[PDB]
Amino acid sequence: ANNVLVVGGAGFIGSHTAKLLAGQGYAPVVYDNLSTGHQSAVRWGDFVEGDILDQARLVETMEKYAPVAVIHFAASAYVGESVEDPAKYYRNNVGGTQSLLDACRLTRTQNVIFSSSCATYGVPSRLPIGEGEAQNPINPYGRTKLIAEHMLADYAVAYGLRYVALRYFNASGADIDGELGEKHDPETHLIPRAMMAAAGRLDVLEVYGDDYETPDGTCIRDYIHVTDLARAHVLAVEHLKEAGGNLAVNLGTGRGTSIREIVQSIGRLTGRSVPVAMRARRAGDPPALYADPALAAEKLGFHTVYSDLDTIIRTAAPHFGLEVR
């Protein structure tokens, strides 16, 4: 009994996690509807094509595989889209998660690792952001992630569900061995966009603000290597497996990275410059956002190992038509 159900396991972070699980002796079973993920990324165990809203098929799957844990990545998201199409996010992130959690309790499938987001915090009072920070999200994406977190808490109370919610800002980089990458269309994440622009796959990288109250002048955000993310989700499995209590922790390096730093590194490491177009800063935009990683260190024994900028850039670059030298 070493099956682990990786819901959303055909996508960016899910496929890396499936690879890691297999490396640690688990048998990842991917359940994915391929809406944004890729069947070719399911290389480390069985594949079940299915939607998490297809509750009968999800229950059927849990009964067949009797997974010792469920890792939930199955929520697609484009940067900025939730404000214009909140219906999609309430349906998938709230409706879909409820269907998953119902499938779990109805099959006595017990351990749920939920991939959440630091977007749940919204604009913070203190940097870095600690788990105690109020969660006042500013868009439906953040809102629906927060709803899922609370749903987990209510299902724990009612049904004895055990869980770990993992919060982080920006998944980045790719597997060190170069055969598994981030394949999104449209690609809305910053480092892929910057690399695509340097590679000539995009014409321009529009950067909104050289004006921020930071060094650089450009905004600071929080980037974690996807392999580090995989590591944490598996540690979370081990935590619940060794009878750990329910957790909600931040994942990251504890240090932010500016846009200038990223563009600089890409140019330096690849020899291709990023064609930046500086546009006016947005009025209510935060200058710096990054999470405090200490609770995850204490509770999970987790530290990032691959989330230096150099490793993030180096591993991602080949997947976007760039060459590292």
Ligand SMILES: NC(=O)c1ccc[n+]([C@@H]2O[C@H](COP(=O)([O-])OP(=O)(O)OC[C@H]3O[C@@H](n4cnc5c(N)ncnc54)[C@H](O)[C@@H]3O)[C@@H](O)[C@H]2O)c1
């Ligand atoms: N990429 C990031 O920067 C980032 C940041 C914060 C949180 N996350 C979390 O990571 C997960 C997204 O992973 P990604 O970043 O790899 O996106 P991704 O789109 O590559 O992977 C998402 C996977 O979920 C599958 N999926 C979507 N809706 C589904 C449904 N209803 N039923 C079944 N399968 C479904 C998609 O086909 C895809 O394979 C989400 O849970 C999100 O909260 C990602």
Ligand SMILES: [Zn+2]
């Ligand atoms: Zn992306």
